[PDB]
Amino acid sequence: LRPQITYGPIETVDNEELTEADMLSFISAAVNSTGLIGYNIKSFDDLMDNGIPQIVKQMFNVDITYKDQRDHTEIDKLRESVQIQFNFTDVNIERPQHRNYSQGNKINLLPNKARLCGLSYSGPVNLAAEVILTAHYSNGRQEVKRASIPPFQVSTFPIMRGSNRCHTHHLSKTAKKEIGEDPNEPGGYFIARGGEWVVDLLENIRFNTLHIHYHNEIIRGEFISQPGGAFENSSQIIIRYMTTGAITIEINSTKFSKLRIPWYLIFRMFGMTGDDSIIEQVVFDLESNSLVNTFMIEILEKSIHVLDPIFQPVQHELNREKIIQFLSEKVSKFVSNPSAYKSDENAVQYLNERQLTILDKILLPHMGQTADTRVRKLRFLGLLIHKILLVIMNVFPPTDRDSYRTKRVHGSGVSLAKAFKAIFNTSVIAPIINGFKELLKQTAFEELTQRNIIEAFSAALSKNTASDLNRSMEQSIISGVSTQSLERKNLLNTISALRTVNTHNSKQTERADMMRRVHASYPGYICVAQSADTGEKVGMSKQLAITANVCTAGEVLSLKQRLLSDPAIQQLADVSNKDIVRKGLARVFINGEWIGCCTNAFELAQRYRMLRREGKVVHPHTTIYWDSMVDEVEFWLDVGRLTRPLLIVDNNIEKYNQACYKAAEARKKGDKDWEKHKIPFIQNTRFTPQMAKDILAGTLTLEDLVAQGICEFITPEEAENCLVAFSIIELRKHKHDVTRRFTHVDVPQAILGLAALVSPYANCTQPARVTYETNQGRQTGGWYCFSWPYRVDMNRFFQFYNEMPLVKTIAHNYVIPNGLNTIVAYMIYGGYNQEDSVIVSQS
Amino acid sequence: EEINNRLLHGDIMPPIGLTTHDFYEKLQLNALKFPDRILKPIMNSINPETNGLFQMVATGAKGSNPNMIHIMAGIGQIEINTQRIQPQFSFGRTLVYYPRFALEAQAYGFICNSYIAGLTSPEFIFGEMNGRFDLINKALSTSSTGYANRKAIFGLQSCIVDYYRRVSIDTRLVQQLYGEDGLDARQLETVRF
Amino acid sequence: MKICKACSSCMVRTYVDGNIIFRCSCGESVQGDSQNLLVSSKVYHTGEMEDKYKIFIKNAPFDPTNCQIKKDCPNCHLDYLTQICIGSQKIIILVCRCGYMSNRG
Amino acid sequence: EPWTFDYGKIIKTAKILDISPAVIEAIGAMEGRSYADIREGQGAPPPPTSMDDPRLMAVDSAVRIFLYNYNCLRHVSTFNKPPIHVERLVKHLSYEEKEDLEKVLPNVVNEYHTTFKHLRVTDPASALLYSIEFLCISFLTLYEIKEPSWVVNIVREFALTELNTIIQSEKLLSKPGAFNFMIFGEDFVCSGEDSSMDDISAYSSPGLLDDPFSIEDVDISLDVLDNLAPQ
Amino acid sequence: RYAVASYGPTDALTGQPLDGKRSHGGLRLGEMEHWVLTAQGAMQTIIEKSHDDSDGCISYIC
Amino acid sequence: VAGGTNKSGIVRPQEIFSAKPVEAEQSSEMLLRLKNPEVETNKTYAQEIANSIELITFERLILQWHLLYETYSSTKKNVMYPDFASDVEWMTDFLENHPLLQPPEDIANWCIRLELNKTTMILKSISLESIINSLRAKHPNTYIMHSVENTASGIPIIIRIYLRESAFRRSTNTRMATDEKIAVNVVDKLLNSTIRGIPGIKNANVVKLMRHRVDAQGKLVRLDNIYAIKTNGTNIFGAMLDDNIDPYTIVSSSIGDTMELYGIEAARQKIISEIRTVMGDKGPNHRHLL
Ligand SMILES: [Zn+2]
Ligand SMILES: [Zn+2]
Incomplete structure (x- = not known):
């Protein structure tokens, strides 16, 4: 679609009255849109309503067969196997409950009772199922018994405080205050065994992307593929280039492990057995004379004739x-x-049908999971091998492990889903499988009734299993899924703990030092000052910048269907590998899935960015990246992206260019006044001083600043297509500079986190000292909690008197200040304040 | 800028053994150093008899001259591993605030402002890059020294002065005389001949 | 490589009495005439050759993150150009959206 | 040269093998269907519309194993030891005439590869029929020869043996019947949709000498680590 | 802050004081402290601390 | 932290204390004093000697190379690669311009085609005859042809080296090496051939150093106007063979190289000098380095 909206001319926007103090309002608006930790609650609610039901109803279908190990005992000689087949049909999670006295009716459980009694703030999980047992006989016939199970409670799932399934979600602030809760805290933690635990954000690599690293292996290319969605199973492929010349494709998934296969065998198993076609998937053309193809063909040819000991x-x-x-x-x-x-x-x-079913679900599942996409996967696999060889040729550098263009931040919703998967099939599926085995051994298959099948499913899931699911989740939450105990030093520490991004858990000396530095991709997303100042943890734990947020998954189907209805994009079935290279087509990806090609990559990305500004067609939270190095367009809508709002800068480069042509045209006509046909260049943001006043009046939010095309969200990979002015003063300095045309304008305070904004005039202090204040501001005495009398906490300090600084900052609009405005004399008084000591007034 | 004008016209020719990129970086690092005359305005703004900040530095009590210059005049060029800020932001850009293949000195870590005037956002980021190394190297100076200290002590501890002032390992000579002079290091006087 | 005309397989190259013979695993054997006398090759400075930056240099005038320079384009007489600096010798190329390219490309 | 599909070649070929022509037309489409339903032709998928249809690559794969195995018989002498599929019939011949069979046998790979790559891109519907018809025409060619008399009995068996194995390989990709599941050697047998025995370590993100930052050789109390603060 | 005693809880295996304040044990004269005391020549202080005050005993050998 | 001068972290101290071999040294240096006290006064002589010793292998003058299965006979038309059949134009010129360099009778069927990097030939100031003479002197089992020294861009300089049959006769009793394996091995030897330098040293700068000396009247004077060469990379024996370097006052930073050529007593003095360099100037007493 083409964008149809138009905005008033940028030459008439009046922003000369804008002060850098007015721009702070914009930051305010941003913080009011995402809250401060709103992503945690949103992610957990997504896991509750959409994640766990999908995982249970889709990814836990059980279909197993077991030997019949009975005795003669009538027809038991003629039956050889029994097939246990079942799946869960209904899933839900309720609010935490407690049983009063004994044989009560499961009254509600408030968080303070859980904290005091050491209880678990866990809500019941109810499941329903249908089970199908098949008995196979020696002659060839088989018998089927089908049962349906009424809903039953398997265990309890931990509930994040303040989320949808929390009792303090249907309560008011006064009611929250009077039940012993901190009425001002946002929540976002779990209560287990009387302790409070924060499930931290985790850095992870970007899925559906190729990460090429150097290391016997010459090079390596890793690609984790996810069929679409935050909670789907992921399967990775590792394409190694060995010193023997062999290229091996290893597939790791829930069914394979560590098996390195020669690269051409994967192509053969899908029906592409001709070598010339197999080579063509990597070089895209056997008739090209390019030196890149000569390099690749020489490598690919040698790899075919290398002997694999296993294959x-x-x-x-x-x-x-x-x-x-x-x-x-x-x-x-x-x-x-x-x-x-x-x-x-x-x-x-049977073995051939089993392998094909397994192969189509673990080999590049993001390109499809049916058999109709086999050749499409081979085209994508050859593209991955092509990229890896481009790095061996030293044409392109390997992947930057520190850049956030290829990183994701996963909260409690994603992390608890991964722990849920590894626990559900152990604490639920495994007991049921053992439950049906022991029933079928002690009783004939044909003697069974509906009652016996329904009883075994419930009986096997005894309170050994009910405890197992809840306690395994708690141990995952406690043992750290990277988690930590919530230490309430003060309100700043609590918020800073929920905005913390942690890296997975190497020993390489250069790798250990590089990951602790501040990267050029951080400004606006990761606080450049907040880190540990001492110990092993220097630079290992990261803080979200003040306006940074964590995206949720978007409607990938709507964008994919629109890209596939676009006349500008040719579907991948309608273009050949020869067409892509001979016509110079540009590959188009959405969430890593190659969907088609376009004749103009820049024009497509430019056109869909303008469609995102209206927001009616393309969602505002859609990442649109154009790779000018390889001419590719990437759309990203997955969960885990960091975004921040940036004010859009518009110019009159269209009119400026036209005036240049008219001035040149007049000069060629012999006119003397050819210079009067030019017009000055103008670039400006549409943010006005009146918009700042409307923000403070509450009548203008970030939602309708985005809706009016004044600001837009930018992701660290989309930030590589942006030229940002660091302040409104730098934009005004270059208002008529045609040689520096910004795409966005920044608010300078957006590069710091919440704890680093406590320091006043922080840009006048040595920057390493601002890092110290982030540590020292989080361990400062104050009102550590507003509900302290209702708590029995260990090593907690409640400082009685606190003051707002005489020179405050914007960080004090969101957290309570902790300290006093002490009168300080900077003097030598007897030598008792030397070497970093101080002299205090006893009064 | 005059180095950039030479580069744009292809006037920069490196000597043998240097590439044009390395020679251009050598020229840019040398051209962006403060002169000695930077203290003329610094010293014209202060009274040495009364200025406490100057007296703490001039007497050796605390601080150095670059500390005063950074506070008062300008920080200058941020230099990590004896070189300017390398572009780690997407192939020729140092930050999102500067274009690709930017030629200005500010894009590569030149901080034009002092601490008393305040740094801008790009200057603070480049300063935070330099200041993060001080924290990383401090944390490494404990573990890296600890690894080397324990291996040096377990290799050297058996060396003990015997009754001949020799240094030996239980019988075996390491030195015929300790320090080749047989003296204690706490008992030495620096003397002119 | 040489591709077998029967089974489209990658043939193995051997040398007999001063001639190249491609023998396949299906028994088919052929002899290359002229285009198969290239045993091996290598090209140096692959990270800075003109073939690497073709797409980037073509796209440079349209990338908004590229450095601009106040200098007239001699073709369309636009008063600004896009300057790029590629290689370890710091080769400067001026490009315009009209197709002009300093170094004549 | 205008090429058109000839359904008579599949009819002729099928009658020789005593199999229904629906089996020949369903080469590469046998996955997911019981061989019984294939034989009558029930549930035949529609003609391909995409050049990326796996059916096109499957039938082309069937053709080139007929050509690959035919040249092994055609070049049986050049092999150090011929493969098992050809040696069991050329065993009784003499090395003089075993060196033969490359001058007396026709070359049936005339213009298949060049034409298949043209038809696959242009019209994938015709690519399926061209490669299906080519397999039948090539089989007939090795079947309808008459001279010399010493070679007719040696390739007519070969043509029957290869085309049967091609159909057999396609048949082994169809829906299995009923059989004892314990012949694999273990008690358990899982299917492709089963998740009861999935790897637990595969639910995490797949995949991943001294620590330079660890105080391992530094003997300092963990309660007094503030002595290391940069200050 | 901490200051303990001439006596207190003792490890059952090593016979040495327990670890730190929370267990009411002693404090650690570590590997690097014995390097410094050896460098100073203070060997009667090592006997007092590492033997008399930690776990020193009498072993009988034929 | 750059490769070849890595002095970051604790790396030089680890090289000394671990007694690492010369191959594992990331910051090895060497100071060479000119044999002539008169030459050491003038910097141009010191600068041309420093640039004289700088390892330029034949590989770094190359843009691309091709290994061709071709033989050269001047009269009989032998088959040639289609991409380089245009090379025949300068074949004829080479034969009429080198009547003494006729192709031999034992040329094998293996050819190496080379395309020289003209920018490196200008930046390093290396002539074509310097390359040809260096390759012919070191590799006698080959026949070398080249185009003219052209001053116009767009016309490359092509080095074409034909292998004689004597290259394969050197060791062919070791039958586990096909003719393609010897020919490729010949490519590696020829590329790594030394042109205008000593092996092991990458950069050779010129430094100004001050030394003491006794005058004719007995006074001791510090002479600041003395020029030396501080190399990047260590080869004491390579510098010991140079006639522009004083061989008795070669100062290597490598303990392993000093131990190899001089002995344990000089290596003892080298460990002292190298620990003191790391220690800085707030360093320990000398008896702790001893
Ligand atoms: Zn073949
Ligand atoms: Zn133009």
Whole structure:
């Protein structure tokens, strides 16, 4: 679609009265849109309403078969196996409950009772299911028994305080205050065993992207693929280039492990067995004379004729069926004797059908999971090998591990889902599987009724399992999913702990020093000053900048269908590899999935950015990245991106360019006054002093500043297509500078976190000293909690008197100040204040 | 800027053994150093008889001359590992505030302001880059020294002065005479011949 | 490489009495005439060659993050150009959105 | 040269093998269907519309294993030891005439590869039929030869053996019947949709000598670490 | 701050004081303190602290 | 922290205390004093000697190389690669311009084609005849052809080296090496051939140093106008063979190299000198380095 809105001319915007104190209002607006920790509550609510139900109803289908190990006992000789098949149909989570006295009716459990009694602020999880048992007989017939289970409670799931499933969500501020809660705190923590725990934000690499690293391995390329969504299973491929010349593609998933396969065998298993076509997926053209192709063809050709010790029998095979059979026998763990099943033809058909089903769900699942996308995956796989060889050729550098262009920040919703998956199938699925095994061993299959099947499912899930799910989640929350105990030194520390970004858990000396530095991709997203000043943790824990936020997943289907309805984008089925290179087409990606090509990458990204400004067609939180180095357009809508609002800067470069042509045209016509046809260049932001006043009156929010096309959200990968003026004073200095045309204008205070904004005139202090204040401001005595009398806390200090600084900062609009305006004399008095000591008045 | 004008016209020719990039960086690092005359305005603004900040520095009690210059005149060029700010922000950009292949000195860590005047946002970021190293190297100076100290002590501790003033390992000579003069290091006097 | 005309496989190259013979695993053998007399090759300074920056240099006038210079374009007579500095020898190229490119490219 | 699909070649080829022509037309489309339903032709997927249809690559893969195995018989002498698929029939021949079979046998790979790459991009519907018809025409060519008399009995068996194995390989990708699940050697047998025995470590993010920052050789109390503050 | 005693809780295995304030044990004269005391030649202080005040005992050897 | 001069962190101290070999040194240096006290006064002589010793391998003068399976006979038309069939124009010129350099009778069927980097040939000031003479002197089992020294951009300078059959006759009893393996191994040897330098040293600057000397009247005077060469990289034996360097006062920063050539007593003095350099000027007493 083409953008249809128009804005008033930028030459008539009146911003000469704007002061840098007026721009602070913009920051205020930003902080009022996202709150301070609103992403934690939003992420946990997304996990509750959408995440866990999807995970249980979609990713936990059980279909297993077991040997019938009974005795003669009638027809039991003629039955060999029993097939346990079940899935869960209904899922929900309720608010935490407690049972009063004994045999009560499960009254509500408030957070303060959980804190005092050492209880668990966990709400019940109710599941429903249907189970299908199949018995297989020697002659060939089979019998099916199907049962349906009424909803039952498996365990309790921890509830984040202040979230939707918290009791302090249906209560007012006065009611919150009177039940022993801190009426001013936002929440965002878990209460387990009477302690408060913060599930921290975790740095992770970006999924559906290729990370190429140097290391026997010459080079390595890793690609984690997720079929779309925050809670789907991810499968990674590692494409190694070994010193022997061999290229091996290792696939790690829930079904494979550590098995390095020669690269061309993956192509053969999908039906592409011709080498020339296999080579064409990497070089895109066998008839190109480019020196890049000569380099790649020489490497690819040598890799085909390198002998793999494991895949020797099928290395020279052109029959795709016999390659699938070899790998299925190689990776299936129930095949303990080879050639014992090859005498049975239906068994060979079973292993081949099993491998194809597994292959289409773990090999690049983000490109599709059906069999209709096999050749599409091979085109994408060849593109990945092409990129990796471009780094071996030293054409392109490897991936920067520190840049946030290729990083994600995952909160409690994502992290608790990963812990839930590894726990649900251990504390729920595993007991049920053992439950049905022991029923079928002690009772004939045909003697069973609906009652017996329904009883075993509930009986096997005893309170051993009910405890197991809740306590395994708590241990994951406590042991740290990177978590920490919530230490309430003061209100600044509590907020700074919930805005903290932690890295996973190396020993490489250069790798250990680089990850602790401040990176050029930080300004506006990660506080440049907040870190530990001493110890191993210097630079290891990061703080969100004041206007930074964490994105949620967007409607990927709406954008994908619009890109596929775009006349400017050719679908991937309608273009050849030769067409891409001979016509110079530009690949278009959405969330890493290659969907098509366009003839003009810059024009498409420019056109969809203008569609995002209206917001009616493209969501405002959509990342639009144009790679001018390789001419690719990337759309990102996934959860975990850091964004900040930036005020849009507009110019009159269209009229300025036209006036240059008219002036040149007049000069060629012999006119003497050819210079009077030029017009001055003008660039400005549309933010006016009246907008600042409307923000403070509450009648203008960040939502309608975005809706009016005045500011927009920028992600660290989209920030590489931006030229930002560091302040409104720098934008005014270059108002008529045609040689420096900014895309956005920044508010200078947006580069600091909340604790670093406590320091007054921080730009007049040595910057390393501002790092100290972030540590020292978070360990300062004050009103550590507003509900302190209702708490029994350990090593907590409540300072009685606090003062607002005479020289305050914007950080004191969001946290209570902690300290006093002491009168200080800067003098030598007897030598008792030397070497960093002080003299205090006893009075 | 005159170095940039030479570069834009292709007038910069490196000597043998240097690339044009390395020579241009050598010229830019040398051209962006404060002269000695930077203290003329600093010293014309102060009274040495009464200024406490100057007296703490001039007498050696606390501080140095670059401390006064940074506070009062200007910080200058941020220099990490004896070189300017390298572009880690997407292939030729040092930060999001500067364009690609920017030629101005400010884009590579030149801080034109003093502390008393305050730094701008890009200057504070470049200053935070330099100040983060001081914290990283301090944390490393404990562990790296500890690894080297323990290996040096376990290699050297068996050396003990015997009754001949020799240094030996239980019988075996390490030195024929300790320090080749047989003296204690706490008992030495610096004397002119 | 050489591609087998029968099974489209990558043939193995051997040398017999001063001639190149491509033998496949299916028994088919051919002899290259002229285009197969390239045993190996390498190209140096791949990170700064003109073939690497073709797309970038073509896209440079449209990238808003690139440095501009106050200098007339001699083709369309626009009063500003986009300056880029590529390589370890710091090669300066001026480009314009009209297609002009200093160094004649 | 105007090429058109000829359905008579599949009819002729199928009658030789005593199989329904629906089996030949369903090469590369046998996954997800029981071989019974394939044989009558029920549930036949529609003709391809995309050049990235896996059906096109599957039938092309079937063609080139017929050509690859044919040249192994055609070049049986050049092999140090011929493969097992050809040696079991050329065993009784003599090395003089085993060196032969490359001058008396036709070359049936005339213009397949060049034409398939043209039709696949242009119209994927015709690519499926061209490669299906080519496999039948090539099989007939090795079947309808008459001279010399000493070679007719040696390739007609070969043509029947290869085309049967091509169909057999396609058949092994279809829906399995009923069989004992314990012949694999273990008790448990899991399916492709099962998640009961998934790797626990695979739910995390996949994948990942002295610590330079660890105070391991520094013997300092953990309660007094503020002595190391940069100050 | 901390100051303990001539006596107190003792580890069952090593026979040395427990660790720090919370266990009411002693404080640690670590590896680097014995380097400094050895460098100074103060060997009767090492006997007093590492033997008399920590775990010094009598071993009988044939 | 740059490669070849890495002195960041604790790296030089680890090289000394771990007794690491010369191959593991990331900041090795060397100070060379000119053999002539008269030459050491003038900087131009010190500068041209410093640039005289700087390892320029044949590899760093190359933009691209191709290994071709071709033989050269002047009369019979032999097959040539289609991309480089245009090279025949300067083949004929080379043969009529070098009547003494006729192609031999034992040229093998292996050819190496080279495309010299003209910018490096200008920046390093290396002539074509300097390359050709250096390659012919070191590699006698090859036949070398080249184009003219052109001063116009766009026309490259092509070095074409034909392998003689004697290259494969050197050691062919070791049958585990196909002719392609020897030919490729010949490429590696030829590329790594030394042109105008000593091996092991990367950069050789010129430094001004002050030394003491006794006058004819007995006075001791500090002479500040003395020029030396501080190299980047260590090769004592390579500098010991130079006639522009005083061999008796070669100062290497490498303990392993000093121990190798001079002995344990000089290596003892080298450990003292190298620890003191790391220690700074607020350093320990000399008896703690001893
Ligand atoms: Zn072949
Ligand atoms: Zn122009």
